[PDB]
């Protein structure tokens, strides 16, 4: 057997852990902070980009930007920053030694998963990866091979019906309406 990192990394909050547990090891909001004022107190140490919980705690002087919007990665540099913080700071594991199981919502543009694979292979040098559909994993977690999963994340909502394992790809309904739209409302 081999230990494979499972990185959900949906919109809103990134939840990463090891395969075989019952709860993600590290769950933090997927935001990237940038200072919007001058530094005047030299000698205390400064950073030009805060990620995750650190960006949340210091949000009073930052411009929080979400790298993912409506389930689509829109800023790949901040996405790489998020993944780096997940690998080397939250899990504290070398990514070039463990497989990675990422998740993607259905009916997204192919360029998204393409660039995701390219980043995970050319930047972190993971030995193997796999991009699974979120609702299928949600059905795995429920311990049944038949049903309609209704997954309503933070940026996207979608339903996938599966019967005896044979998912019907012609009745998958996606709907860009989730926690962020409700927050704005």
């Amino acid at each position: 057997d081999i230990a494979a990192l499972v990185v959900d990394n949906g919109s809103g909050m990134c939840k990463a852990g090891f395969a075989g547990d019952d709860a993600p090891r590290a769950v933090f909001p997927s935001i990237v902070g940038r200072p919007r004022h001058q530094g005047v107190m030299v000698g205390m140490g400064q950073k030009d980009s805060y990620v995750g919980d650190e960006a949340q705690s210091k949000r009073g002087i930052l411009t929080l930007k979400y790298p993912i919007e409506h389930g689509i990665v829109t800023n790949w540099d901040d996405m790489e920053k998020i993944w780096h913080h997940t690998f080397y700071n939250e899990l504290r594991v070398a990514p070039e030694e463990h497989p990675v199981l990422l998740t993607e919502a259905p009916l997204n543009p192919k360029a998204n998963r393409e660039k995701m694979t390219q980043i995970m292979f050319e930047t972190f040098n993971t030995p193997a990866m796999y991009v699974a559909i979120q609702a299928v994993l949600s059905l795995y977690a429920s311990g049944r091979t038949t049903g309609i999963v209704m997954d309503s994340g933070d940026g996207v909502t979608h339903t996938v019906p599966i019967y005896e394992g044979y998912a019907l790809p012609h009745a998958i309904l996606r709907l860009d309406l989730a926690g962020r739209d409700l927050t704005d409302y």
Partner: peptide, 7 residues
């Protein structure tokens, strides 16, 4: 997105 919606 590129066309329709932002992303």
């Amino acid at each position: 997105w590129x066309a329709x919606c932002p992303a």
